Amino acid sequence: TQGMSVVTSFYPMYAMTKEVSGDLNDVRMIIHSFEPSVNDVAAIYDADLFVYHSHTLEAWARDLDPNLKKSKVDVFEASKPLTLDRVKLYDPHTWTDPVLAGEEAVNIAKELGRLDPKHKDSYTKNAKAFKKEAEQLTEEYTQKFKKVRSKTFVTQHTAFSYLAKRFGLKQLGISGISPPSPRQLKEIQDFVKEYNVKTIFAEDNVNPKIAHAIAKSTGAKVKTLSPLEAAPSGNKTYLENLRANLEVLYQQLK
Numbered sequence: 001t002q003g004m005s006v007v008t009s010f011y012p013m014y015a016m017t018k019e020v021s022g023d024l025n026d027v028r029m030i031i032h033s034f035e036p037s038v039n040d041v042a043a044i045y046d047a048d049l050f051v052y053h054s055h056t057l058e059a060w061a062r063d064l065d066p067n068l069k070k071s072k073v074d075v076f077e078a079s080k081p082l083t084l085d086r087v088k089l090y091d092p093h094t095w096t097d098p099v100l101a102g103e104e105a106v107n108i109a110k111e112l113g114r115l116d117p118k119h120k121d122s123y124t125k126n127a128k129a130f131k132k133e134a135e136q137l138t139e140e141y142t143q144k145f146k147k148v149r150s151k152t153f154v155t156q157h158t159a160f161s162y163l164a165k166r167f168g169l170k171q172l173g174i175s176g177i178s179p180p181s182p183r184q185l186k187e188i189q190d191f192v193k194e195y196n197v198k199t200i201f202a203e204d205n206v207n208p209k210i211a212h213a214i215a216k217s218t219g220a221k222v223k224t225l226s227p228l229e230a231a232p233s234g235n236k237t238y239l240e241n242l243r244a245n246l247e248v249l250y251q252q253l254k
């Protein structure tokens with residue numbers, strides 16, 4: 001409507017762009033196994049800016065060909081300047097590390113500014129505030145995590161490896177990069193005991209029966225920890241949502 005038409009692949013892309021773009025543009029949203037519908041694709045070609053995270057995640061972003069469709073959408077890989085770790089094929093889940101969520105918002109600002117130079121400074125300022133909020137979050141939880149009685153946890157999938165590097169914590173996913181054999185089940189329960197883990201973290205929108213069973217047979221409590229891959233209910237900013245989840249983690253490792 002007003003300003004540029006911006007499309008994004010999934011919640012962390014949507015929320016970072018939205019906060020960095022402030023009230024200037026039109027920001028909309030369209031995961032490991034997701035293919036765009038014919039409507040999604042049409043709406044990408046129709047946009048000025050489509051923001052996705054990594055071709056290691058939304059692999060389909062590469063099949064887009066604005067040249068053929070005589071469209072002028074700018075296909076934009078927001079995590080390019082980020083070094084990704086190998087599994088562990090790379091682990092895409094950088095967004096749950098507050099610092100790295102920062103670098104990526106800063107990057108999305110840069111691109112918005114290329115597309116629309118008049119408000120360049122404005123994108124920049126919003127990115128800086130986001131960055132500086134991410135750093136207050138990193139610090140607060142750097143303090144909090146060095147005084148917990150349990151530094152290890154298990155999550156429904158391997159989505160928190162970056163969050164875990166950042167806070168000196170150890171994680172294991174029941175599934176891997178994407179949402180487990182009989183051996184793996186056994187290995188997970190052994191990991192739980194070797195490290196004495198008191199909470200298995202399910203995620204909403206993935207069937208929790210396997211986490212409950214592991215927890216049951218292992219003396220551990222199931223709880224919920226969101227990779228922020230699906231959009232959260234409510235009206236919190238990206239980092240408010242990331243904070244609430246760091247805090248579930250700490251309440252449980254406390």
Ligand SMILES: [Zn+2]
Pocket residue numbers: 032093157158159177178179227229
């Ligand atoms: Zn994931």
